[PDB]
Symmetry: C3
Subunit: 125 residues, 3 copies
């Protein structure tokens, strides 16, 4: 039932959630990145996570980066069994480069509840 994580390097920061009813934990960059205009980057967090059973982890955008700096998050579907280093794919749609520094919050991680259905083909629904 808890979200567990481990730091893969000392550059990682433990994810935080200030409000008890916020949808997501903050994810912090482990490194500095410069993302030119209309360009993408995979920002490494250097953490691995073990999500609660019954959800996947969605890497979702922070609201202020989106509205103020035209930053979006691509990809974003972390499967329940993924134990690698969590990467945030950021898209910079703004006309200026966007700087990430180590320790900056750059996305949030949401435990999205889903079904894992078996699939069946039929002739017509």
């Amino acid at each position: 039932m808890q979200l567990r994580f481990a730091r893969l390097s000392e550059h990682a920061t433990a994810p935080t959630r200030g409000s008890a009813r916020a949808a997501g934990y903050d994810l912090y960059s482990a490194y500095d990145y410069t993302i030119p205009p209309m360009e993408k980057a995979v920002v490494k967090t250097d953490i691995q996570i073990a999500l609660p059973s019954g959800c996947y982890g969605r890497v979702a955008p922070r609201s202020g980066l989106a509205a103020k700096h035209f930053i979006d998050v691509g990809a974003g579907v972390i499967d329940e069994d993924y134990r690698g280093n969590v990467g945030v794919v950021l898209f910079n749609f703004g006309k200026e480069k966007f700087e990430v520094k180590k320790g900056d919050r750059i996305a949030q991680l949401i435990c999205e509840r889903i079904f894992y259905p078996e699939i069946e083909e039929v002739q017509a629904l």
Copy 2:
């Protein structure tokens, strides 16, 4: 279990959902906006919402605006305890300006079920 909302000005339109089984309620703009090509705008609904317990409110794209006009929704994670004016971050990736008129539907609001886990750091998963 219901979704409650209040109008913050008389320009607001109550969200609607025509089908009992549609994923989202329609969100309507409270104002006119002109969003140039490759630009973004924060479109105010002038409503506040109180989402049902156990979900967050995802502001998600309308399907036709995306396929027909290349409009996408940025940000989009409204925490369950957010009581301010609901804003829709629209991105216009088309080659022509996109007009929003007051009263237009410009996104949909989905009650996405999530866990709110506690977090635990371990040395290694």
Copy 3:
């Protein structure tokens, strides 16, 4: 319940999920498409789906197409009662054209659990 689907033409490919704990089933293009830089396309799968009760179907990005080729998915909210041809709205934000060949996996379908709340207006929350 299960996810049922039917092929609407012989060009469709049954969706697949390699891992038991992957969040989504891969969706396959039924046709070739060439998506120029900064353009979008509606890629038809020629399948119809019947999603389990209690979810909508989100068309979500494949992680590799996003990080390696700057491909994103627009629209993406398939209501639980939709019985038409599933279309994937791909956005190519890359500097080079992106080729979809028939039979290529171009998105994933996630059964995102949601509430279907009734709506109530109040004077102020």
